[model samples]
Target chain A: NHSDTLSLSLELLQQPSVTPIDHTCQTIMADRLAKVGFHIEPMRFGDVDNLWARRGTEGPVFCFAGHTDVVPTGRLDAWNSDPFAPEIRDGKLYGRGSADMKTALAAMVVASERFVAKHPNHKGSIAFLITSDEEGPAVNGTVKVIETLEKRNEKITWCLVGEPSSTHKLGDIVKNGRRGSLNAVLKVQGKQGHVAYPHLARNPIHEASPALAELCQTVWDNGNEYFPATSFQISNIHAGTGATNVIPGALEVTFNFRYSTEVTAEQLKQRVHEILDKHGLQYEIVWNLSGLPFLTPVGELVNAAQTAILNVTGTETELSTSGGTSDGRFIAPTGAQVLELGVLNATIHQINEHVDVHDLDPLTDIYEQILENLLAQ
Target chain B: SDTLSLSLELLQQPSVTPIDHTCQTIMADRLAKVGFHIEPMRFGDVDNLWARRGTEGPVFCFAGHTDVVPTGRLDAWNSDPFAPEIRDGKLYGRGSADMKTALAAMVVASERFVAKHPNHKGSIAFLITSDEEGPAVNGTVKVIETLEKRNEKITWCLVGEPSSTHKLGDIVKNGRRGSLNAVLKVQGKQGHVAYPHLARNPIHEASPALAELCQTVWDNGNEYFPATSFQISNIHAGTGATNVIPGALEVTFNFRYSTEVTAEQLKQRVHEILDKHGLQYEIVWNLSGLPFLTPVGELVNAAQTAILNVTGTETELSTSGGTSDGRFIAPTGAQVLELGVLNATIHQINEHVDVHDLDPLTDIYEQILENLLAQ
Candidate 1:
């Protein structure tokens, strides 16, 4: 059975999908969903291919969300084997997308096939939402697919995304939420002149040193439960002309914050302004926010996932809200309880990316148990 | 009588930097007619004249530059810079106050001194260069190098630099403050602004060091010299990208230091401060000129007495100003003194000098020669 998961993973892994391109991977998965008596609809938005498949039309919809595309293979030579060839070495499968969800995709498909075969008339419906653009801009991916589903008044009660979440073994860790990512570019202005005449010109570096050092040392918030305290870091700073006798006019500083739900982006901006103004600086800050912090507290989806991982692997799973943004960010707002679970993520985006060959079957077992705990009546 | 006429002849030449035209030849012809040994020293594109009378010890030398700085605009002047024009009581021209008058006075004083004392004690010499306003490499420095090579030494040297600030024979510069320049680069690691944990921003690391440098007092000057002054000329750091931390920071600074601190001491203290701040940096120092001084010795006393006698004013000795070729001639154990006409209009648009003061300057030069080498 584990070999069955490995074979299906290898079949999809050979596509060289490389983000926002299905390369027939989704069509292959869609044909399997159709054979399992599910209605399949191919949603194409721009260059992205998405699949919406459902076993039945009813409430309590249990949905599996994931992407068919993988990140680039990186350097071909750094790999012990071909990244797209999908080789099995020392009880681990090596490939470009092996651990970063392709193996989980196989486990999800196999787990859904067996569960649907037995529970032909289950209490709730089962569905799959797969996209090809999650690794790219994520524009024409789950965001647009969710828009279409919202237009049709379709809703998911519980959504499981097959992103790699474990650090060492399968079913060890699951991401219940992700922190927010915000970036800012700050420009400090001053007058330029000769250094011999220091009284006439202001040195922005002198004015900004204490302020920037203060900003780097500021504790935005002490995170409550699910998140850690907010963190801020300056990435760039610059000002000057090449002449040793002349002064520079303007200075630029760039910084980033990985913040928690304890503080809002606007609050953070105001605090930054208050500090820079307190230092008597003439500055302009440009802010760009990629995502807002989201959390999924203890509930049906979380409890079901906890009980399933314990039952299948006998390993207690830890809930975390770290790492980058995911398509789950788009789905969680639609009243869906979202959680991510898969194989070890230690080597997800690295060369010779791989997952233990032994973790495949247990991953399938966990998904099947999660399906049973949620959908069985 | 001849001092004003000779100054008129010398000021008429538009010899701007390294171009003597015929100024040296005119002086050489007059010196040769006055029974002096004239040797024309030409190095690179510069022309130098070294003339001596009696060829003996206790040598009294008149050091000066013939080449003048460029005149800005002819229309901005009341008359041509190359055409010596007398307006009211002032002799107006390009090189009038900037030592063409002094150069003519040196010649006239020597001519009259030789006629009065045909057999004076020791010797009187002339050291004239044509590239003092330019990069002084091929001018006085080269001539001094040649003289040093032959073991020819000057005992009391009087340099006709424009030392008087307010009036003729008022302030005489006996020494000058040393000039030192340095360019520094503070290096740090570069990384993404998004991950400040990984990248080391050089700008932040260099800020405290720069602040400390701006606030440091190298030394309080001694009696002979003023306190050494430090200035930051330029400071720069970063890549233009707001999201990227820069790898290094560059700064340039200069010092007009006193004799109280040597170049070595200043450099050592700077290193100590940078290390005290725990900075990783590379620095380069450029020493243009060293501090040179001549404390009221034989040359100073002679020039002070002569200035007082000729102008009826007490001359004050100073060790300040930007720089000059005197830094070149002072190293040979000679008591050097810099005295000349009023500098108020030396490098200005309508550079001029009082015609009445021209004959007095010649008399002062003669008295200085008499005090130094009279038998």
Candidate 2:
């Protein structure tokens, strides 16, 4: 019944699972999965709860990846109803993780139950990899679970992460890839003195201004067809002690890049150094590679997702590589074709986060058809 | 009274900026006794004393201010700022080195000069004000305006500002650099940093122009002044949010420029640089003081010779340092020069001056008067 996905979604949303805390939501799912001829393995690593449930032991593993935790409700008074109460108003369900991924997780379990009950002997194994640390530091969750599975030679041939990817419709867009993110904190050194005597002291703001202007104006690269051009942004810049007569001793700048496949993170760092050096600035920079660009071409997983969206919702899903990083970044590195699909992401990570109530059944059907296209014989 | 005794009496009064508090009256009493005709001019709560001994063609005026800056943090001072104290050959008071001691020396020097030459050449005048350390609007500026309206001119003016660096009579200011200030605002559209293409960053737009301004050599300076300086005192942009770009950048900068460049020329050059970069900005300029120079004339020469005769040191003539009331009097075609005690401790916590230097400064003033007005 369509009520199966709605009932399970409400049940999961009722749990106040705010980041790295499953709060028995995983236990509820494990109880149901264990009853349906599935082996449930609960992995608890460093305060984070994770669950690995498999239907059968077979060759090609089709895994459903998602998170059970939700971001904190910013202000309780800002919401029309309780965030943890899971209220439905005017054909929409409202909660903290309703639009983010909890609803997708519910759809994944319901789709697996129906698929397993109908086709008792499927083509391959169906697995669910659920973690509560995806919204937190992500250190001891998917990365650790993937490490454990890699050591035991348990491979996932195709992984569909239930991240909210739709923009306007139920099945409008699927993120087949994600651009890389690189961060840097740059510090420029100079001497401080009175403004009356500019000759005796060096001003870091003036020394670094030209280089910053050049960096802001330079074009990193033109992105390929799937992604737009690589972008650079200076998020924070600070210097001075607020006294007008005193020159500042040093300047600090924090910038980030949403880079495309046209250039690597190493290349971006080198180009930045070259620009700063050319300006004769004495500066130090610390770089952080948050994520590497990952792409899954038109392969088995991509075709199955697109065909399932068309068959279930009568929509032509577009492939996209925009937005920030996700757990697909960790899985795609291990030779698994990873794609992200779910309900509308417009209200994700925001107050009054909600989704269209009509989208729940259609999304469950889409998940079921993707399974049928991939593992059904 | 000697310079020290008169300085003690003058320093006893707590005459803060823009408030004479009887300090100007004490000076006017001294100058009036020395044959100077005292005319107290009060404008906008500021008391200015214009005292002259005679009505003549060559008016030699001693210009100074009786008011001093605030004492600042009473507990941080070793002694009461108003109660003049002498310890270990140094006199500690708020205006001890700034000008009160110099004011007493000017009065004593005038008394000695008039006694030595009963009828000295030219007129001896005193232009004293109580608004130098404040806004300076109602002080020398108003007195000069009244004098200018009545066509009462000063030929040779000596300003007793603290001009020495190490010792009394070691450095005398012949002129001063021009002061110009500007407030610039560069406009841009603000948006999220992640969507840089949709928004314009003013800090980015103004950086190249600021670097060029910092690196540009406006002038090499003339013989008397150092190179003209350009400094960005304060620059601010952003709303303290890392993810959001700011809509505008506000900058406060100052120029201590020499005679080689006018305020207009500097403004023009700055506009050219910013315009070349195609910036959309608005700037407001304030001309605080214009550059003035006396250049080895009678006033400068008299002070240099007087210093050598009194202290056996060749005083250096400079147009550097900061602006003085001489800037207000110099426009009247007067030969303005600043000479006084050492300036190492002026405007500081335990403001002081060498007690021995007081008599030497008195001797230097007397010699300058004798060299210039002796008949």
Top of the candidates by DockQ: 2
Winning model by lDDT: 2
Report the alpha-carbon TM-score of model 2 versus the true structure. 0.58
Model 1 TM? 0.52
Best by TM-score: 2
Off by over 4 Å in 1: A1-56, A67-141, A191-205, A235-249, A343-361, B1-375
Off by over 4 Å in 2: A1-145, A148-157, A161-173, A223-229, A311-315, A322-324, A341-377, B1-195, B198-205, B208-229, B233-313, B319-375
Q: List the residue pairs that clash in candidate 1.
A: A235-B193, A244-B233, A244-B234, A245-B233, B221-B227
Q: Please, what are the lDDT tens digits per residue for candidate 2 over residues A1-377? A: 43888899999999999887899999999999998887999899999999999988886899999999886664578689999999888999998899878899999999999988888778989888899987655777888888988999999989999998887898788887888878788989776544554555677887787888788779999899988788887756777644444456678787878899999999999999999999898889988776788887668988998899998888999989875557888788788889899998766655578999899998998998889989984
Q: Candidate 2 - CAPRI tier?
A: incorrect
The stretch of ten residues in a row with the least summed lDDT in candidate 2 chain B is B238-247
At residue A287, candidate 1 shows an lDDT of: 90
Task: Please provide, for model 1 over B112-181, each residue's C-alpha lDDT reduced to its tens digit, 9 standing for 90 to 100.
Answer: 9988878789988899999876557789889899999999998988888777866778988888888777
- Candidate 2 lDDT by residue in tens digits, B82-120: 999999988998889888999999998898888989778
Clash statistics: count for each candidate: 5, 0
Query: Which stretch of 10 consecutive residues in model 1 chain A shows the poorest summed lDDT?
Result: A191-200
